[PDB]
């Protein structure tokens, strides 16, 4: 009875992979990552500024 | 000559008055009680509105070839009010042009290519371009330069 309800939709459905936040989770082809997280890891993705 | 050589604004009226003769096309009972589109707020002013619509629909079959229900719905769709929020583009109703398509097909002017829409018969082609040549032979007199 202490298990969280599986949520297919709503904000509780998704979850940032790295830091574990429920806030803005960006899903450009499914990253499942927080907005604050993406900044520290984008150059490691190979992303680049232009 | 062809439809491409004449303005569409006059050609649609000519086609409408010509198709008014053939009884294959007829506005159903619900026709005078439905406005011409979801994007439209007010009913059509004239009562000939039905026969222009077919006169429009067949015209696109001469131009866009096999086109189905939804793309035609898109073409007739237009700009509509949304309260305080700004205007938005919406799609025309389905059955209004669907029954028109059935009437045109039953008249033999057009035929169906499944999975692609409906194309125009050589009979329909000859009818439309005969109307167009009539209009162009007319227009060459008031406007000589179209003779070129």
């Amino acid at each position: 009875y202490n298990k969280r309800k599986p949520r297919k939709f709503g904000k509780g459905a998704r979850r940032c992979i790295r830091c574990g936040q429920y806030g803005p989770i960006i899903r450009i082809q499914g990253l499942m990552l927080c907005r604050h997280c993406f900044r520290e890891v984008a150059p490691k993705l190979g992303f680049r500024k232009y | 000559a062809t439809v491409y050589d004449v303005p569409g604004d006059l050609l649609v009226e000519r086609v409408a008055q010509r198709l008014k003769e053939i009884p294959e096309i007829k506005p159903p009972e619900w026709a005078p009680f439905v406005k011409t589109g979801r994007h439209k707020e007010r009913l059509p002013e004239q009562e000939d509105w039905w026969y222009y619509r077919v006169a429009s629909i067949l015209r696109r079959v001469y131009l866009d070839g096999p086109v189905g229900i939804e793309r035609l719905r898109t073409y007739y769709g237009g700009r509509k009010n949304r309260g305080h929020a700004p205007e938005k583009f919406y799609k025309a109703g389905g059955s209004i042009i669907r029954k028109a398509l059935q009437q045109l097909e039953a008249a033999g002017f057009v035929e169906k290519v499944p999975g692609k829409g409906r194309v125009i018969t050589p009979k329909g082609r000859s009818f439309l371009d005969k109307i167009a040549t009539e209009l162009k032979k007319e227009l060459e007199e008031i406007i000589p330069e179209l003779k070129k």
Binding site: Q29, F38, G46 | -
Partner: protein, 102 residues
């Protein structure tokens, strides 16, 4: 009459370039016809995110870009030719997908 379509995806243009050099220098050594390398429109992926971690402050955003280059090479069906393509050393960044069409 049978041909092989090969599509090479690479984030690195140069890693693509030497692999294309390998497959093209295969062609004249093998004496088999080769249609020139077709460069597809490079696919750009754009992602924008506000710089501020909290809500305070002005609005400043960072726009990250991924450019993945796609190239096509179409070659004949020569068993000796296609036997030497799986022996090609390919970098980890590059990927190769081959279909055999008629």
């Amino acid at each position: 009459m049978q041909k092989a379509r090969i599509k090479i995806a690479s984030t690195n243009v140069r890693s693509l370039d030497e692999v294309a050099n390998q497959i093209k220098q295969i062609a004249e050594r093998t004496g088999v016809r080769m249609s020139g390398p077709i460069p597809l429109p490079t696919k750009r992926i754009r992602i924008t995110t506000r710089k501020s971690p909290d809500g305070e402050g002005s609005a400043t955003f960072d726009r990250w870009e991924l450019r993945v280059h796609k190239r096509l090479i179409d070659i004949e069906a020569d068993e000796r030719a296609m036997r030497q393509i799986m022996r090609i050393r390919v970098p980890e960044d590059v990927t190769i997908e081959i279909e055999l069409i008629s």
